Design a protein around this ligand. Structure first.
Ligand code: W7Y
Length: 167
């Protein structure tokens, strides 16, 4: 038994809810929150801008030190950093950006990083501000992640479409 509430169960391991990943993290304080990162960990908008704002910019300060030491992530890659006031850890995952000409098959590579963590609260990768078809992103998630993932989709219209179209 865990602390996540109000989720619809899609599969043995994938759960979904119409929620802001930020308010959900503040309420639950999960072990892992996933950020929809870019390779530079520049948290300017969307999930990353909203998560970073909720940390009072401490996520950006930590991220700039990470990049100064390690250089950029790979598209499809990830790193584990602090979850600050939101979670124990933040898993920064880089889904492809189709607005940059970046392989949609890197989205499966992005969701494979979730399998190193038994449970995660996560957003739909490569959606919203980043561009991909969220219905596709949910299918890849279900067919790739084997650990327990709680998806917070911040669009009720899109949430209802994802649920009503889910195979
Ligand atoms: C969850 N998803 C978030 N987005 C923003 C862009 C893409 C993603 C969803 C919007 C439908 C998919 C946000 C943003 C702030 N909080 C969020 N929580």
């Amino acid at each position: 038994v865990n602390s996540f509430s109000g989720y619809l169960k899609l599969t043995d391991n994938v759960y979904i809810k119409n929620a802001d990943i930020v308010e959900e993290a503040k309420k639950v304080k999960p072990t892992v929150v996933v950020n929809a990162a870019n390779v530079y960990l520049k948290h300017g908008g969307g999930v990353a801008g909203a998560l970073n704002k909720a940390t009072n910019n401490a996520m950006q300060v930590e991220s700039d030190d990470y990049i100064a030491t390690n250089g950029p992530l790979k598209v499809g890659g990830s790193c584990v950093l602090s979850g600050h006031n939101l979670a124990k850890h933040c898993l920064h995952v880089v889904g492809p950006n189709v607005n940059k000409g970046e392989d949609i098959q890197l989205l499966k590579s992005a969701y494979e990083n979730f399998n190193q963590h038994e449970v995660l609260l996560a957003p739909l990768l490569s959606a919203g501000i980043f561009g991909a078809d969220p219905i596709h992103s949910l299918r890849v998630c279900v067919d790739t992640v084997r650990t327990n993932v709680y998806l917070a989709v911040f669009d009720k219209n899109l949430y209802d479409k994802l649920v009503s179209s889910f195979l």
